[PDB]
Design a protein around this ligand. Structure first.
Ligand SMILES: CC(C)Oc1ccc(-n2c(C(=O)O)cc3cc(-c4ccc(C(C)(C)C)cc4)ccc32)cc1
Ligand SMILES: CC(C)Oc1ccc(-n2c(C(=O)O)cc3cc(-c4ccc(C(C)(C)C)cc4)ccc32)cc1
Ligand SMILES: CC(C)Oc1ccc(-n2c(C(=O)O)cc3cc(-c4ccc(C(C)(C)C)cc4)ccc32)cc1
Ligand SMILES: CCCCCCCCO[C@@H]1O[C@H](CO)[C@@H](O)[C@H](O)[C@H]1O
Ligand SMILES: CCCCCCCCO[C@@H]1O[C@H](CO)[C@@H](O)[C@H](O)[C@H]1O
Ligand SMILES: CCCCCCCCO[C@@H]1O[C@H](CO)[C@@H](O)[C@H](O)[C@H]1O
Ligand SMILES: CCCCCCCCO[C@@H]1O[C@H](CO)[C@@H](O)[C@H](O)[C@H]1O
Ligand SMILES: CCCCCCCCO[C@@H]1O[C@H](CO)[C@@H](O)[C@H](O)[C@H]1O
Ligand SMILES: CCCCCCCCO[C@@H]1O[C@H](CO)[C@@H](O)[C@H](O)[C@H]1O
Ligand SMILES: N[C@@H](CCC(=O)N[C@@H](CS)C(=O)NCC(=O)O)C(=O)O
Ligand SMILES: N[C@@H](CCC(=O)N[C@@H](CS)C(=O)NCC(=O)O)C(=O)O
Ligand SMILES: N[C@@H](CCC(=O)N[C@@H](CS)C(=O)NCC(=O)O)C(=O)O
Lengths: 148, 148, 148
């Protein structure tokens, strides 16, 4: 299979796809919270679910949206960087570690965010996960620059 | 051409690029609504377009931003998943159907959102489009896992 | 290296990775502004940094978030379009120009946004950067369609 175009690719695809699914889980949770708290973003939604007064903001809904937004700010760049990095012939174990640190850091981030864990737990998980991203970004820069 | 690296790739690239253009259309509409409703996000914009009182929120602008955000939550993962999935040798017709259901579902979503269609029309289109994404995500998981 | 799979790829990877790093810079700035202005999005953050009254919005924080969001609306599609476009055998110099115009336009956009430059400076930089994206999108459409 084309999944074996590089030794690091399967690990990357496993971690990335799990993270995409993790984002879908955040979307599902957001919808559930909207229904439970009766806090809808649109009048058409509110009118179907009890009346116009339910078109309103809710702190738990806003928190879910923040977690999802932070995912978009971090996981989407990883999908790009990790894919490219997989083809630069990195040491297989080193590549694994980059992907695993990102996966664990990001899952922990969502748990810390939605679970309202004390500071600086969420911030630490964010920083931890950004480290392999910074590392991959620099490696790609060098490889790209040297092939110009 | 490298567009023929896999039988499903041309269909994927057609649908994905149309969806990117569809997002650009949402951005264009957002700008048009800001100008028509005189609702700008920045004081520098407002001062150029009639005065400081026009740095303000507007429900139609907010709706446009929600549609665009929902696109980012769904179309961006599809760009990743669909690209990878194209290289897993899926049945050409089955792959076509995954891409077409996503394309139709997402175009319908934007129409339902910006057109303020009654509930649950928008929600149904969202769910419909997520189905092929879930399907592709699971298929990638199995392929990645089995190549570890 | 696989970075040489197409003549335009190294230039694309250089520009894209610089833009990802530029987004990370926006994230770093956002955090710094939150701390300086004592404007946190979460009560757990606020309580660690001086008290519950510091869970509040701030116009400079909101501006940073807008810049980051606009980046997600524009740079993420470029990561997709530019990657695909690199493999369509475009003229090397023409491809370079597409990538450079996007890079310069987007860096200028962030400077214009965060620097609060007068209108329509930011809007012009946005439009300039979208031009090569529109161009690449259409080229991909034709290539994909003709391979169906
Ligand atoms: C609310 C936002 C805008 O402001 C702040 C957020 C968090 C923090 N904050 C604190 C603190 O005392 O609150 C400690 C702390 C520690 C790390 C860290 C992470 C990874 C490492 C490794 C070992 C993985 C390199 C080492 C340290 C990151 C952030 C940290 C400070 C300000
Ligand atoms: C506002 C948000 C937070 O809350 C809700 C939103 C929508 C819904 N909602 C309703 C309802 O009665 O309002 C019916 C309904 C039906 C589907 C659906 C979609 C695809 C299928 C196929 C056939 C494609 C599998 C089957 C059913 C999805 C959502 C649906 C309920 C709650
Ligand atoms: C706040 C938002 C919602 O509304 C507006 C924002 C900006 C503008 N605005 C104005 C104006 O007078 O304010 C001039 C202007 C000029 C260009 C442009 C860009 C690139 C080119 C090239 C040469 C690169 C093709 C040519 C012209 C774009 C936008 C422009 C108008 C409305
Ligand atoms: C990938 C999805 C991860 C979901 C993690 C949800 C963690 C929720 O965890 C819950 O958080 C509540 C506050 O929100 C607390 O009151 C509960 O003690 C805690 O169990
Ligand atoms: C935080 C950034 C992590 C550092 O990243 C490191 O940068 C080095 C110098 O560019 C490279 O040689 C290494 O391959 C890379 O892992
Ligand atoms: C890809 C871009 C799709 C744009 C779809 C725009 C649909 C707008 O549709 C309009 O919506 C208005 C309410 O907003 C209604 O008053 C009008 O009856 C309806 O024509
Ligand atoms: C909603 C999820 C759609 C189901 O997706 C299906 O999952 C099966 C089991 O993983 C796979 O064998 C199929 O290829 C896949 O289409
Ligand atoms: C990639 C990151 C780009 C950061 C660009 C930051 C530009 C900040 O620039 C500053 O903006 C202030 C208003 O915000 C002005 O008061 C200052 O005159 C100006 O120096
Ligand atoms: C703004 C859109 C920029 C125009 O883009 C151009 O479109 C032409 C027709 O599709 C193509 O032949 C060119 O390759 C492309 O650069
Ligand atoms: N957009 C982010 C930029 C910086 C960032 O990502 N910070 C991390 C660590 S404090 C975070 O978890 N932010 C919470 C969030 O984005 O809602 C923000 O506003 O905080
Ligand atoms: N971020 C979404 C997560 C769930 C979701 O995507 N729901 C669909 C179906 S109800 C939707 O169209 N949401 C509207 C939106 O995202 O603004 C939300 O807040 O609703
Ligand atoms: N989401 C954008 C859509 C249109 C757009 O991207 N406009 C450009 C040029 S005016 C911009 O810089 N918008 C500022 C922003 O997105 O915050 C908006 O709300 O303005």
């Amino acid at each position: 299979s084309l999944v074996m175009s590089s030794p690091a690719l399967p690990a990357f695809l496993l971690c990335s796809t799990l993270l995409v699914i993790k984002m879908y889980v955040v979307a599902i949770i957001t919808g559930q919270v909207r229904l439970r708290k009766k806090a809808f973003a649109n009048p058409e939604d509110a009118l179907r679910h009890g009346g116009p007064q339910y078109c309103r903001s809710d702190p738990d809904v806003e928190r879910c949206l923040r977690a999802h937004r932070n995912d978009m700010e971090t996981i989407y760049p990883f999908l790009f960087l990790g894919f490219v990095y997989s083809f630069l012939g990195p040491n297989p174990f080193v590549a694994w570690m980059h992907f695993l640190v990102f996966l664990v850091g990001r899952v922990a981030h969502t748990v810390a965010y939605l679970g309202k864990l004390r500071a600086p737990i969420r911030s630490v998980t964010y920083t931890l996960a950004q480290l392999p991203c910074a590392s991959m970004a620099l490696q790609i820069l060098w490889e790209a620059a040297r092939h110009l």
